[PDB]
Design a protein around this ligand. Sequence first.
Ligand code: HEM
Ligand code: HEM
Ligand code: HEM
Ligand SMILES: [As]
Ligand SMILES: [Mg+2]
Ligand SMILES: [Mg+2]
Ligand SMILES: [Mg+2]
Ligand SMILES: [Mg+2]
Ligand SMILES: [Mg+2]
Ligand SMILES: [Mg+2]
Ligand SMILES: [Mg+2]
Ligand SMILES: [Mg+2]
Ligand SMILES: [Mg+2]
Lengths: 156, 156, 156, 156, 156, 156, 156
Amino acid sequence: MKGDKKVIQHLNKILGNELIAINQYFLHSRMWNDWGLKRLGAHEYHESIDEMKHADKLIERILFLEGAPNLQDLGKLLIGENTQEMLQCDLNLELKATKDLREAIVHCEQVHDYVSRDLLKDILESEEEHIDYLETQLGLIQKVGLENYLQSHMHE
Amino acid sequence: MKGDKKVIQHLNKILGNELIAINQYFLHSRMWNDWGLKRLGAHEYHESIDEMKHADKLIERILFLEGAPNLQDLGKLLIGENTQEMLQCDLNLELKATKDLREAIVHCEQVHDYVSRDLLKDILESEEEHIDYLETQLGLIQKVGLENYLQSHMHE
Amino acid sequence: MKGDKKVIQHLNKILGNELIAINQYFLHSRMWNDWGLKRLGAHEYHESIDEMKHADKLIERILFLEGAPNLQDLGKLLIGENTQEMLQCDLNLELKATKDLREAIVHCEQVHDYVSRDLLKDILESEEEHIDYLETQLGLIQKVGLENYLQSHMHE
Amino acid sequence: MKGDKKVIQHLNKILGNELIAINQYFLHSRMWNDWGLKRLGAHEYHESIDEMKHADKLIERILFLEGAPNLQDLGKLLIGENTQEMLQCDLNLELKATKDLREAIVHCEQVHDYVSRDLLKDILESEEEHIDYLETQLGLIQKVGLENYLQSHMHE
Amino acid sequence: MKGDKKVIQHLNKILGNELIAINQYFLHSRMWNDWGLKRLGAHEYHESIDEMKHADKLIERILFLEGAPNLQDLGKLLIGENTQEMLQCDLNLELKATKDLREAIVHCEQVHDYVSRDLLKDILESEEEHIDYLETQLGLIQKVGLENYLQSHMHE
Amino acid sequence: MKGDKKVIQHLNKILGNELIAINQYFLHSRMWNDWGLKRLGAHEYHESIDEMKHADKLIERILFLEGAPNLQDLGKLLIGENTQEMLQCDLNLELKATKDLREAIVHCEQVHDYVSRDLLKDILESEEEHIDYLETQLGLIQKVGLENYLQSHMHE
Amino acid sequence: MKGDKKVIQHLNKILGNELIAINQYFLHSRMWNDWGLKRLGAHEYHESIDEMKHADKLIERILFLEGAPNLQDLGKLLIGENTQEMLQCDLNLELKATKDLREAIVHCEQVHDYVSRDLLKDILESEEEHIDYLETQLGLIQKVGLENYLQSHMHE
Ligand code: HEM
Ligand code: HEM
Ligand code: HEM
Ligand SMILES: [As]
Ligand SMILES: [Mg+2]
Ligand SMILES: [Mg+2]
Ligand SMILES: [Mg+2]
Ligand SMILES: [Mg+2]
Ligand SMILES: [Mg+2]
Ligand SMILES: [Mg+2]
Ligand SMILES: [Mg+2]
Ligand SMILES: [Mg+2]
Ligand SMILES: [Mg+2]
C-alpha cells in the first residue's frame, strides 16, 4: 500500500531514535551489571528490549508502506560515566525522542495516515512512561541520597 | 426506623470527616507513588479504601434511620508537601476524627442507640490503629533517619 | 515532565466532574439498596467504582505533568428522590461531563498532548456507555411501566 | 455435477429469501438490544445466524450443481417500529419463505433431484419452527399483556 | 444520545461497504472451497466474518446515536472469475473502503465525535491488514508461480 | 415383511453397483499406495469402506423384505492406468450409480415403500459427495498441474 | 581485571561485526515476512537474536577486562533485493566475520587470554553453523528451482 513519502521519512527517523535507544540502554544495562548494580542492570535491559520491539513495529510498517527501513545510520549514543550521568543521558535521549514523535503525529494527521498515528501514539505512551521512570530515579537520588540509591539497586 | 435527629447529625459529621480522609489519603498515596515511594503509597491507598468502607457503613445507617446522608459539604484536606509533613497531616486529621467519634458515642449512649454506638466504636478502633501507624512512622524517621526510612519504602 | 498549563487545568476540571459523579452515584446506589431495589443498587455502585478508577488515572496524569490535583472543590451533587429522577439526574451530569471532555480533547490535540488526549478518549467512551445505560432505563420505564421496571430491579 | 437449470433457479430464489431474513432479523435483534430488551435481541440474533447457515448450504449446493449463487439482489426488508410489529414482520417474511420452499420441493421431486429436496425440507423444518415461535410470542403478548411480555424479555 | 446527522451518514456508508464485503468475501470463500482451494476458502471465510463483526459494531453505534441503519441497500459485488481476479477484486473493494474511512474520520474529528472516530480507526486498521494480505498473495503468485501458489492452498 | 417384488429388484441392482465400486475403489487405493501416492490411497480406501457400509444396509433391507441378496453377479470394474483415468473411471461409475438410484427411488415412491426411499436417498447423498470429490480432483489437476497434484498426495 | 589492550580491540571488532549482523539479518527477516516468506523470516529472525546474544557476551567480557565497548560505529549493512541476493549477502558477511574471529583467536593465544579465546571459539562455531545453513540454502535453490524454494518457505 503506497504510503505518504514524508510519513515514511518520519517513521524512519523515529526508527533512528529507537536504534540509538536500543544501544545506549543495552550498554548502560551491562555497565550497571558490570559494577554490581544488578537491579539497575536488569531494569535498563528491559527498557532496551522495549525499544527493540518498537523498532520492529516501525520496520514492519515502513515495509508495508512500500518504503525502505533504515538500519544503517546510527546517531550519537549518550553514555554516562556514573549512575547519575547514565540516567540523565537516557532522559536527554527520551526528550529528544518525544518531540520527534510529536512532529510525526501532526503530519500523519494532515495526510490521514491514522493507523500510523496510532502506532506512534502507542510508542509515545511508552516513552512518556520511561521519562517518568527516569525523572523519578533522579528524584529518589535526592530524597534518599546516592549511596542508599545504589544500595537499593545491588540485588534483584 | 425513625432515628434520633441528633444521632443522625453526629453520623453525618463523622461521615464528613470520612470524606475528607478519603480524598486526603488517596491524594497522599498517588503523590507517594509519583515520587517512587511505592510502599508508602500502597499503605496509604489501603488507608483510603478503609475510610471509603467506613463512609459506606455510615451512609447505610443514616438512610436506615431515615436521615439524609451528606456527601456535598466537603471540608478541608490537609495535603503535606513532603513525607514527614504528609504523615503529620494524616495524624491531625485523625486526632480530630477520634474526638468527634467519642462525642458521637456519648450521645448515642445517652439516647440508647446502642447499635449506632457499636458501629462508631468499631470505626474508632480502626482510627486508633491508623494513629498508631502514623506515630510509629514519625518515630521511625527519627530512629533510622529520613533517608533510610524513605529508602525502605521505595519498593515492596 | 512539564506539561501545558491549560491541559492540567482541563484535567483538574474533568477530575472535578468525576468526584461529583463518585459521590452522586454512590449515594444513589445506597439509596436504591436502602429501598430494596438491589439490582439498581448493584449497577449504580459499579458506575461509582468506574468513576473512581477514572479519577485515579487523572490524578496520576496530573502529578506526572507536575500539576497539583484538586480533590478539594466539589460541585453540585444532583440527588433525585425517586427512581425516575435519580436516573434523569445521573444523565444530566453525564451530558455535562462529555461536553467538558470534548473541549479538553480539542485542547490536548492543539498542543500535541496526545497521551492525555487518549486517556480522555477512553474516559469519554466510558461516559457514553453510561449515557446509553441511563437513556435505555428511562425508555424501559416507559415501555414496561414503572411498577414492572421496579419489580425487575428488586432482586440481584 | 450439472443440475437442472430450473432447480438452480429455485435454490437461488430460496437463497434470496434467506438473505432478506439474515438482514431483517439482525437489525431487529439489534434494535431490541438497543431498547434494552436483551432477551429478544438474543433470540432474534440466533434466528439470524440460523438463516446464515441455511444460506451457506444453499450457496454450496448451487455451486456444486455448477450454478452461480446470486448474493447481489437483496429483496425488501420488513422492519417494524415496535416489538409487536417486528414480530409480525418476521411472521410475514417466514410465511412467504415456506410458500417458496414448497414450490421448490415440488420441482425437485419432479426432476428427481432428491438431495436438493432433502436440503429444502430441512430448511422448511427450521422455517416452521420459526413460524411457531413468532405465533407464540404474539399469542403471549395477548395472554400476559405487552408490558409484561416486554418486562419478561428485558434481561438475558 | 443525539448524534451529528452527517456522522450517522458516514457510519451508514461504511456499513454499506461492509455489507458488500461480507457478501463478496463469503461468496469468494465458497467458490474457493468448491474448487478445492480450501486454505484460500478458510482464510477468505474469516475475512467475511471479520467484516460481519464491523457491521455489527456500526449498526450498534448508529442505533445509539439515534440513526437508522441501512441494511436494505447493497452495492456492487466484485466477483472474480479465478484466483487472481478474485484477489484483485477484494483489493479494489478494500481501496474504496479505506478511502471512505479516512473521509469519515476527518468529519468525526471536526464535530468532536471522538468515539465514532476511534471505532472507525479500529476498522481502518483491520481493512489495512486485509490490504497487506491481498497485495502479499498477489506478490507471492509472482514469486512462486500460480500453479505452486494454488498448490499451497489446496489443503488446510 | 413381504416387500414389493420390483422394489426388491431395484435394491439388488443398487447393491450390484455397490459391489463394483467396492472392488474398483479398493484396487485403485492399493494402486495409489503401491505407487507411493499414500494420501490418494488413504482417501480411496475410505471411499471403498463407505460403499461397503452401503452394501451392508442394502443387504439388511433386502433380507427384511424377504428377498435374496445377489452378491454373485459382479459387473464390470473400470480400472484405470494413471491417476487421471482412475479418477475419471470412478466418476463414470458414480454417474451410472446415481441414475439407477433415482429410478429406484421413483419406484419406491409409487408403491409407498418410503423407508426404502429414505435409505436410497441417504446413499444418493453419499454418492453425490463422492462425485463432488472426484470432479474437484480433476479440476485441481487442471489448476496446479499433474506433477504438483501428485506431489501433494505422496505423504499422508 | 586489566586485560591486554589489543585483545580488547579484537573483541570490539568481533563485536562490531555482530552489530552489522544483527541489523542485517533483522532487516532481511522482516523483508521476508513482508513478502510472505514467513519461514525464511522466522529463521533469519532467530539468526538475528543469536547474534544479539553473541553481542551481549562480548560486551560483558570487554567490561570485565576494563575496556569500553563500542556500539556507536555501525559497519556496512549488506542488504539484498531478492531472496538469493539476501542469502549471499549474509554469506558474504559471515566469511568476513570468521576471518576476523580467527585473527583475534591467534592473538588471544599469544598473550594467554585463554578464556576470551574460548568465548571466540564458541562464537566461531555458531557462525560456521550459519555458513553451512546459508550455503545449503543456495545449493537447494539450484536443486529444486527458485519457485519451489520460495514456495517451501511461504508458511511456517
Ligand atoms: C546492541 C545491539 C543489540 C543487542 C545487544 C540485543 C540484545 C538482545 C537480547 C539479549 C535479546 C533477548 C534474546 C533472548 O534471549 O530471548 C533480544 C531480543 C530482541 N531483540 Fe535485540 N539486541 C540488539 C539489537 C536489536 C535491534 C537492532 C533490533 C530491531 C531492529 C532488535 C529486536 C529485538 C526483538 C524484537 C527481540 C525480542 C524481544 C522479546 O520479545 O523478548 N534488537 N535482543
Ligand atoms: C477522590 C475520591 C475517591 C477515589 C479516587 C476513589 C477511588 C477508588 C478506587 C481506585 C477503588 C478501587 C476500585 C477497584 O479497583 O476495584 C475504590 C474502591 C471503593 N470505593 Fe472509592 N474512591 C473515592 C471515593 C469514595 C467514596 C466517597 C466512597 C463511599 C462513600 C467510596 C467507596 C468505595 C468502596 C466501598 C470501594 C470498594 C472497597 C472494597 O471493598 O474493596 N469511594 N475507590
Ligand atoms: C447483515 C449482514 C450480516 C451481519 C450483520 C452478520 C453478522 C454475524 C456475526 C456477528 C456472526 C458471529 C461472528 C462471531 O462472533 O464468531 C456471524 C456468523 C456467521 N455468518 Fe454472518 N452476518 C451477515 C451476513 C452474512 C451472510 C450474507 C452470510 C452467508 C451467506 C453469513 C454467514 C455466516 C456464518 C456461516 C456464520 C457462522 C455461524 C456459526 O457460528 O456457525 N453472514 N454473522
Ligand atoms: As511444487
Ligand atoms: Mg506488501
Ligand atoms: Mg428503610
Ligand atoms: Mg507509638
Ligand atoms: Mg515526576
Ligand atoms: Mg465442482
Ligand atoms: Mg438509546
Ligand atoms: Mg425377517
Ligand atoms: Mg570490574
Ligand atoms: Mg554445504
